[PDB]
From TrEMBL, chain A:
Signal sequence segment: none
Species of origin: Vigna radiata var. radiata (Mung bean)
Gene: LOC106765552
Family: Belongs to the gamma-class carbonic anhydrase family.
Protein name: Gamma carbonic anhydrase-like 2, mitochondrial
UniProt lineage: Eukaryota, Viridiplantae, Streptophyta, Embryophyta, Tracheophyta
Location in or out of the cell: Mitochondrion membrane
UniProtKB/TrEMBL annotation, chain B:
Protein name listed in UniProt: Uncharacterized protein LOC106767534
PANTHER family: EXCITATORY AMINO ACID TRANSPORTER
């Protein structure tokens, strides 16, 4: 049972988009904050006014909220993933 | 020199308006020229209008001289 749908993309020509809304849960960065271009902000993530999420990081708050404060920093390969219900 | 003071004033005010909201100083580097232009024209017209109103005030005072000349 391993049928590959040939309509599956193998080169998206547009990388993993930075800000991934998850059904009316548009993650929000403040105009002062700095997220890298590699980082992936999916779901209920908020970056509050001076924080920095450095290259190669992932924040998928799809179960709960994840909120980075005033000038906090989350370094390179961090992974923040809200736990279960 | 008036236009230079006006231009510097416009540039300063535009950098200000770009600094209040935390976005960087020269966010739209094509607004700053509009700011310089508006500041220049404003200061030039302000000097012109001050000269004009001084002239009118001096005429009004000269006419007030006659209102008190008949007083004596």
């Amino acid at each position: 049972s391993i049928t590959p749908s040939p309509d599956r993309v193998k080169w998206d020509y547009r990388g993993q988009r930075k800000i991934i809304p998850l059904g009316q849960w548009l993650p929000k960065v403040a105009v002062d904050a700095y997220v890298a271009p590699n980082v992936v902000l999916a779901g209920q993530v908020t970056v509050w006014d001076g924080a920095s999420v450095w290259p190669g990081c992932v924040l998928r708050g799809d179960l709960n909220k994840i909120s980075i404060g005033f000038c906090s920093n989350v370094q390179e390969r961090s992974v923040l993933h809200a736990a279960w219900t | 020199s008036a236009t230079t003071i006006g231009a510097l004033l416009g540039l300063g005010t535009q950098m200000y308006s770009n600094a209040l909201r935390k976005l960087p100083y020269m966010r739209h580097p094509w607004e700053h020229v509009v700011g310089m232009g508006l500041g220049a024209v404003f200061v030039n017209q302000l000097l012109k209008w001050e000269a004009q109103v001084e002239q009118d005030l001096d005429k009004m005072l000269e006419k007030a001289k006659a209102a008190n000349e008949r007083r004596y």
